[PDB]
């Protein structure tokens, strides 16, 4: 995911004289979707494109992952309405990555459709798809609905992995259903999956953080590096989900800390003389509450110190092309991410009247609930 | 009124920047833009050119345009002016050509800029593009400066190219202008 | 029926075209018209855009009076006889500065002759009361312009032209002399007709090339505009001046069909010569001392006017949006303005806001200096309809000058909003 390096790369590349191949676009398109510097990739992507090199379905299936990272579903459907004139079929990663993007994002009835599709040109649905599937239930009110698919993960293979067990340990855990839950817990916790799978359960439950005994998922967290940021920035989301809604806020907001100290989590955070912000437009509701908790503290510990306060302090939770409508209040981070702070603080901070695509607070404004 | 002020203090930063040249500066402030949610500004980009355009970043300056290309905003004049004076030191001219093609289909006069090529190549001593760039200029119907057309002719002659010389009085001619006795003078230097 | 500038006002005698018609005078695809402004050339047709330019009117040479430029003088349609008693007076002239005077004289001699065209136009060209020359301005009018430097100018100028009158309308002058002036009222409607009326061009009759001043019939009836729809050429061959639609202009009919009198200058010149002043002269001049300087580049562009220094334009092509607010005045401010361009080095925001304010103080300033207000001139202006004319001038050129100066406030003003997006 480093692109500092990639555009060091292509620099020397250039000034070499060797015009860039088709794969190295993906890859970097692939970095940036991470860090979410859309325009980044854009000028990669076109670079691709003013080589004129004849672009391969991977340029187009790490486009639509790159750009579902953030959860533009305009762009989305620009990109799949292009690739059908292009010339190109749609394969299986292709869905995989419009269904990602829709489900942090809106329109909810559009991925059923897609599935639907998908059966029709015999797409050979595989365990991604299926969990995505099962993830189409579970931003919505539908608790018991989405169980079908938990059986059929569990009957066509193996029990789902834990990024699907605490997303539904979750989704129970924000209904009203606390106790019945706890056996469910119990379950990934004393059964036969893989040997890190166990340790995974134990972290949450009890105490087990100390100086010694919160250094054993040290290890943990440091093996799945494999991935490549595909599923551990997804494992760390989920994670984190799991871990605030029900459960101690003080456990569970901590593994952002040696997610940054990885950098696997960037520009969670925005600092400058001039602007103060924090990005959350890549993450999940239940989170967000948490680095704020930390955030207002964190400002509290520089607040004796004494420093000037920015003119303008942000909340980035929707980019795009979408940023100007009215549409953007139906989205699933904006139903929750308000409710936290409209409970903890003084709401002086709105959406904007120039972009009505995140939470802004004037300086004045934010002095007094500070005080 | 609240946009106001806040935008009007950003960009107050982005110009201090821009003038001490930190193209890197600037880029943080772009990317805080975004989180502000400042909307992203044709003039806002601008600074960003110049500051690679000050330290002869070709790269740079093209990636910088490149970004604000895709957004959609049509470049404001006096970018696309900086980047031409640049890489006419450069010698660049089919790119700074290139340039040139692309101000026209955003609806623009090119006559001001071809001025500056043509007269930046020559103090950068790279004369056969300069003649290049000023025929193809005129056979379009653009106009000249006095002050071009008598460069271009004394320059020829001092190294010894009448043909190009020639090709350039009779276009002054055609054009309107017609000759004195300079321009006959430094003709004959090559001629006797 | 359809709205047309030409609408509003009335077709004038048949007899205006009749008298010139049966000499060689040949009009295609115009008209004339008369309104309370007097006189004016209007389009009958449409035209298309054109390739080469198009003939709109063609005089002769005999219906025109004409003088050389340099000492020796000829006069080409050649009425003087030889031995008259005016060569003397057209003699005993300044030959760089007053031509105004030597045509004056030419024209009260063509009066006084049989057959010539002049006798019968005459009647036709301007009076006393209905022309706004200031040679026929009272002290009064003088002084409501409000402006020092003009009205002493014009004094001069008045004063100079009854000279003339008294040292060669003296007391022994021969009938044929006298009868040409008898009052000194005479010679002034003829200065003010050669000032307003006369023409520069360079003509070519046989193998002589010379340059000339002369006064043209029915090629005085165009009126300014510093856009102009036409312009005038000198034929040859057949010994005629041709007024000529340039090339590439639509036309549509009702139109007014007009001609550039002078280029590059300001309205003091205007009002000097012709009485008239215009609210968009491109090339007026507000002074300021003041040492504040906003940047030129970006003046440009929010306004986007194109263009060289010397020739500045605004792109309507760029202006999507239907715009208005930049006319004539704004390109005028542009010149004026003083500021600083410094090789690519963008402005810092906050520091131009400071050039904003000082600038605007210096235009408060001047407003104030005035006796009154704009708003207070329209109502004098508005309050009597009928009035010497010179009069409806004066207040006119004032309201001009401190409409400009308002304008710029206005446009400084909006610089600042769009130089922060």
Redesign the interface.
């Known amino acids: 995911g480093l692109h500092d390096d990639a555009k060091r790369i292509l620099?020397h590349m250039?000034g070499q004289g060797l015009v860039p191949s088709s794969k190295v676009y993906t890859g970097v398109i692939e970095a940036y979707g991470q860090a979410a510097?859309y325009?980044?990739a854009?000028?990669a992507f076109?670079?691709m494109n003013e080589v004129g090199s004849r672009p391969m379905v991977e340029t187009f299936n790490s486009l639509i992952h790159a750009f579902a990272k953030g959860g533009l579903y305009k762009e989305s459907e620009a990109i799949w309405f292009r690739m059908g004139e292009v010339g190109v079929p749609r394969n299986r990663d292709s869905f995989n990555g419009m269904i990602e993007g829709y489900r942090q994002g809106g329109q909810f009835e559009e991925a059923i459709k897609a599935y639907v599709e998908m059966e029709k040109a015999r797409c050979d649905p595989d365990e991604r798809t299926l969990e995505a599937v099962l993830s189409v239930y579970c931003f919505a009110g539908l608790v018991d609905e989405s169980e079908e698919q938990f059986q059929e993960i569990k009957s066509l293979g193996i029990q789902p992995s834990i990024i699907c067990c605490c997303m539904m340990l979750a989704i129970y855990a924000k209904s009203e259903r606390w106790n019945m839950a706890h056996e469910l817990l119990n379950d990934v916790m004393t059964n036969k999956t893989s040997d890190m799978h166990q340790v995974i359960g134990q972290m949450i439950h009890g105490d087990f953080d100390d100086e010694n005994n919160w250094q054993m998922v040290e290890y943990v967290f440091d093996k799945l590096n494999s991935e490549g940021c595909g599923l551990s920035m997804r494992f760390y989301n989920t994670l984190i989900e799991a871990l605030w809604w029900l459960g101690q806020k003080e456990r569970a907001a901590r593994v952002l800390n040696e997610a940054t100290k990885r950098g696997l989590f960037p520009?969670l955070f925005?600092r400058?003389?001039?602007?103060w912000?924090v990005?959350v437009h890549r993450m999940w509701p239940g989170g967000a509450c948490t680095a704020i908790s930390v955030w207002l503290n964190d400002m509290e510990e520089l607040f004796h110190k004494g420093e000037e306060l920015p003119?303008?302090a942000?909340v980035?939770v929707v980019?795009g092309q979408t940023?100007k409508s009215s549409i953007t209040r139906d989205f699933p981070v904006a139903k929750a991410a308000y409710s936290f702070l409209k409970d903890t603080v003084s709401s002086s901070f709105c959406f904007?009247?120039?972009?009505k695509?995140?939470i802004?607070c004037?300086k004045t404004q934010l002095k007094r609930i500070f005080s | 009124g609240t946009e106001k002020v806040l935008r009007l203090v950003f960009m107050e930063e982005l110009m201090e920047r821009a003038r001490n040249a930190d193209s890197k500066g600037v880029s943080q402030v772009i990317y805080d833009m975004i989180a502000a949610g400042l909307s992203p500004g044709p003039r806002s980009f601008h600074g960003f050119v110049v500051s690679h355009v000050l330290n002869r970043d070709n790269d740079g300056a093209m990636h910088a345009l490149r970004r604000e290309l895709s957004e959609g905003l049509r470049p404001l004049h006096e970018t696309f002016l900086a980047l031409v004076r640049l890489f006419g030191a450069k010698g660049l001219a089919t790119r700074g050509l290139e340039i040139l093609a692309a101000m026209e289909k955003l609806k623009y006069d090119i006559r001001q800029a071809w001025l500056v090529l043509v007269e930046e190549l020559v103090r950068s001593n790279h004369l056969e593009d300069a003649n290049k760039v000023f025929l193809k200029g005129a056979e379009g119907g653009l106009r000249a400066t006095d002050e071009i057309y008598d460069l271009l002719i004394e320059q020829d002659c001092k190294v010894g190219d009448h043909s190009n010389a020639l090709t350039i009085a009779y276009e002054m001619e055609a054009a309107g202008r017609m000759a004195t006795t300079f321009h006959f003078n430094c003709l004959l230097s090559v001629q006797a | 029926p359809h709205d047309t500038p030409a609408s509003q006002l009335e077709l004038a005698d048949p007899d205006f075209y009749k008298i010139g018609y049966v000499r060689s005078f040949r009009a295609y695809g115009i008209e004339f018209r008369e309104g309370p402004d007097g006189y004016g050339v209007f389009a009958s047709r449409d035209v298309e855009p054109l390739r080469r330019a198009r003939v709109i009117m063609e005089i002769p040479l005999e219906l025109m009076l004409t003088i050389s430029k340099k000492l020796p003088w000829m006069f080409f349609p050649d009425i003087i006889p030889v031995g008259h008693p005016i060569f003397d007076i057209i003699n005993s002239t300044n030959p760089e500065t007053d031509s105004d005077l030597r045509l004056a004289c030419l024209l009260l001699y063509a009066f006084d002759c049989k057959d010539n065209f002049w006798q019968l136009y005459g009647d036709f060209l301007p009076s006393d009361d209905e022309c706004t020359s200031f040679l026929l301005a009272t002290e009064e009018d003088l002084l409501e312009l409000q402006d020092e430097k003009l009205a002493s100018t014009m004094r001069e100028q008045q004063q100079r032209a009854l000279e003339f009158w008294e040292k060669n309308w003296h007391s022994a002058v021969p009938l044929k002399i006298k009868r040409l002036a008898r009052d000194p009222e005479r010679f002034i409607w003829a200065m003010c007709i050669a000032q307003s009326r006369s023409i520069n061009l360079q003509m070519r009759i046989g193998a002589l090339v010379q340059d000339a001043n002369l006064l043209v019939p029915y090629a005085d009836m165009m009126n300014h505009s510093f856009q102009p729809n036409c312009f005038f050429h000198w034929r040859f061959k057949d010994r005629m001046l041709e007024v000529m639609i340039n090339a590439g202009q639509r036309i549509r009919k009702g139109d007014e069909m007009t001609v550039d009198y002078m280029a590059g200058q300001k309205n003091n010149f205007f009002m000097q010569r012709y009485g008239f002043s215009s609210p968009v002269n491109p090339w007026d001049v507000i002074h300021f001392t003041g040492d504040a300087k906003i940047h030129l580049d970006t003046f440009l562009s929010v306004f986007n006017i194109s263009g060289l220094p010397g020739e500045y334009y605004h792109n309507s092509r760029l202006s999507n949006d239907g715009d208005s607010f930049v006319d004539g005045a704004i390109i005028a401010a542009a010149r004026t303005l003083p500021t600083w361009s410094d090789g690519d080095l963008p402005p810092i925001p906050s520091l131009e806001r400071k050039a904003v304010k000082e600038l605007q103080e210096e235009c408060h300033q001047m407003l104030a200096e005035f006796p009154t207000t704009s708003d207070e001139d329209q109502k004098i202006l508005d309050s009597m309809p009928d009035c010497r004319r010179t009069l409806e001038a004066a207040i006119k050129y004032r309201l001009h000058r401190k409409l400009l100066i308002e304008k710029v406030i206005q446009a400084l003003d909006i610089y600042q909003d769009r130089i922060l997006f």
């Not at chain 1, 400058?272 to 602007?275: G, P």
């Not at chain 1, 904007?352 to 972009?355: L, S």
């Open positions: 620099l250039n510097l325009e980044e854009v000028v076109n670079t520009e925005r400058n003389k001039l602007v912000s990005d003119q303008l942000s980035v980019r940023e904007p009247g120039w972009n695509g995140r802004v004037q």
